[PDB]
Design a protein around this ligand. Structure first.
Ligand SMILES: CCCCCCC[C@H](CC(=O)O)NCC(=O)O
Ligand SMILES: [Fe+2]
Length: 285
């Protein structure tokens, strides 16, 4: 492990001797540093899958148009016609944050990268929460937030010529809004996390079930730095893609968003998403 914290680089990951990596060792590195780069791995699809199985329980994405043609577990973001889906993740989110079991870990392998300006922005939601005074934290504790993904589900090739209301209705059954505690506690690190997302968090309600003042959700979102279109907030870390360098991170603690670029060429990334078996997203706080 070269550095410490978000950009930490890890050098010994050999795609033909993955049996040397144990689950507890890679998990502890990820929990501690939150975002790590497995440098110069360049795995095949099957070696990637082996590494994913080391990390945790691989969950395939629910929508098969994202699947790798040969490996349903691999979520494919690619500008190649008919390969996965182009330009995914162009908005702040947590992977599967709208689903019954959000992922513990996300893992992205960049396969083709044009230029050197694309990657992912990350925000540490535990550091945001720890930054807030107790009086500001108090309206958020013991509440439930609603996360509505539906407006961000993408039109699929098989949706062409469907009435949009029927596509919407199908989305509403597949990915209905869901409620999570506004503040959660990481089941492993003990860290409290402000689990809110400008893209999908619509409201906060208290233990009675009453609406909390809309000014509370708005203030907290602003505090995360998710509402600055110029990405200058101190809480934003920028991680640039590099071919073969695998990006692996804690999907409970980090909110992220695609960073786009200007260079011509194919952008192709493969993603594996894993549960760790612990309370997800976390314990209520
Ligand atoms: C709660 C915020 C809604 C996020 C919409 C989810 C669509 C994305 C895929 C894509 O960006 O096309 N989901 C990926 C995942 O959750 O792992
Ligand atoms: Fe994502």
């Amino acid at each position: 492990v070269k550095g410490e914290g978000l950009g930490a680089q890890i050098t010994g990951v050999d795609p033909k001797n993955l049996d040397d990596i144990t689950t507890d060792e890679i998990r502890d590195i990820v929990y501690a540093n939150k975002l790590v780069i497995l440098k110069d791995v360049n795995p095949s699809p099957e070696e990637f899958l082996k590494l994913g199985k080391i990390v945790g329980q691989i969950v395939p994405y629910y929508e098969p148009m994202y699947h790798h043609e040969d490996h349903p577990e691999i979520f494919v973001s690619s500008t190649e016609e008919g390969q996965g889906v182009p330009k995914t993740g162009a908005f702040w989110h947590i992977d599967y944050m709208f689903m019954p079991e959000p992922f513990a870990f996300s893992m992205v392998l960049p396969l083709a990268v044009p230029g050197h300006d694309r990657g992912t922005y990350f925000i540490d939601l535990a550091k945001v929460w720890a930054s807030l005074p107790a009086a500001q934290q108090a309206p958020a504790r013991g509440t439930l937030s609603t996360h509505d993904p539906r407006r961000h589900i993408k039109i699929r090739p098989s949706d062409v010529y469907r009435p949009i209301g029927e596509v919407w209705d199908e989305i509403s059954r597949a990915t209905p809004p869901i409620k999570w505690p506004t503040v959660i506690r990481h089941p492993k690190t003990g860290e409290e996390i402000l689990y809110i997302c400008a893209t999908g968090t619509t409201k906060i309600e208290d233990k009675d079930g009453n609406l909390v003042d809309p000014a509370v959700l708005a203030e907290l979102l602003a505090a995360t730095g998710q509402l600055d279109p110029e990405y200058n907030s101190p809480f934003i870390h920028t991680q640039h893609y590099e071919v073969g360098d695998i990006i692996l991170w804690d999907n409970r603690v980090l909110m992220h968003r695609a960073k786009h670029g200007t260079a011509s060429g194919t952008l192709t990334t493969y993603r594996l998403t894993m549960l760790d078996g612990l309370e997800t997203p976390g314990y209520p706080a």
